[PDB]
């Protein structure tokens, strides 16, 4: 199991523009196109992303490319984020994946707000931080996912993904 497999499991893969649980235009493996309501807006952003007139549809290949970019950017974001970096560097590799998962899903910012869990996580207090992260709009909105991620973080194993 690795970050790619894990997120491919959490985000799925759609070749057509779709709405996320939030109602936002998205495509591929969790690639947010836009927050705007304009589906037209969404196609433009999709065309710009891909480099051609997709007309709202992409190939598998294309989706995997956006995905590759998205993970990479997620990683680089953490590494340049200051609340973030130190936590990440303190972690073992499974747990680092969990953090990347969160950042991909919610952005540096949203991940920034787990200050209290995250400090607990810097302190290696698996149990507490986990219960703390659970009290979040994130968990209440996508509980199954959240649960897999918090288990991975707490445990340092991929059990939740088996
Ligand atoms: Ar956390
Ligand atoms: Ar967590
Ligand atoms: Cl892009
Ligand atoms: Cl979920």
**CATH assignment of the domain containing 20:** 1.10.530.40
Distance 149 CA to ligand 2 centre (A): 7
**Closest ligand, as measured to the CA of 20:** 4
**Closest ligand, as measured to the CA of 120:** 1
* 31 bridge partner residues: 27
- Declared resolution, Å: 2.1
Quick check: 36 and 26 in contact, CB under 8 A?
Answer: no
**At 123, is the secondary structure helix, strand, or coil?**
coil
Catalytic residue among 10, 11, 45, 62: 11
- Domain with 56, as residue range(s), is 1-162
Read off φ and ψ for residue 106, nearest 5 degrees: -115, 0
Q: How many domains does the chain have?
A: 1
HSE of 36, CA atoms in CB hemisphere, 13 A? 9
Q: Report the candidate in 19, 54, 52 with the shortest Cα–Cα distance to residue 33.
A: 19
Q: Any idea what the Cα angle at residue 74 is, between residues 4 and 8, rounded to 5°? A: 25
Q: Please tell me the experimental approach by which this structure was elucidated.
A: X-ray
For ligand 1, whether the C-beta of 129 sits within 6 Å is yes
């Amino acid at each position: 199991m690795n970050i790619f497999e894990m997120l491919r499991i959490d985000e799925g893969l759609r070749l057509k523009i779709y709405k996320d649980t939030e109602g936002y235009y998205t495509i591929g493996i969790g690639h947010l196109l836009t927050k705007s309501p304009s589906l037209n807006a969404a196609k433009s952003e999709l065309d710009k992303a891909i480099g051609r007139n997709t007309n709202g549809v992409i190939t598998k290949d294309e989706a995997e490319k956006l995905f590759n970019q998205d993970v990479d950017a997620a990683v680089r974001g953490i590494l340049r984020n200051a609340k973030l970096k130190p936590v990440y560097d303190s972690l073992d590799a499974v747990r680092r994946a969990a953090l990347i998962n969160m950042v991909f899903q919610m952005g540096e910012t949203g991940v920034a707000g787990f200050t209290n869990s995250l400090r607990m996580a810097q302190q290696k207090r698996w149990d507490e931080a986990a219960v703390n992260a659970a009290k979040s709009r994130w968990y209440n909105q996508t509980p199954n996912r959240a649960k897999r991620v918090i288990t991975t973080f707490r445990t340092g194993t991929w059990d939740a993904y088996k």
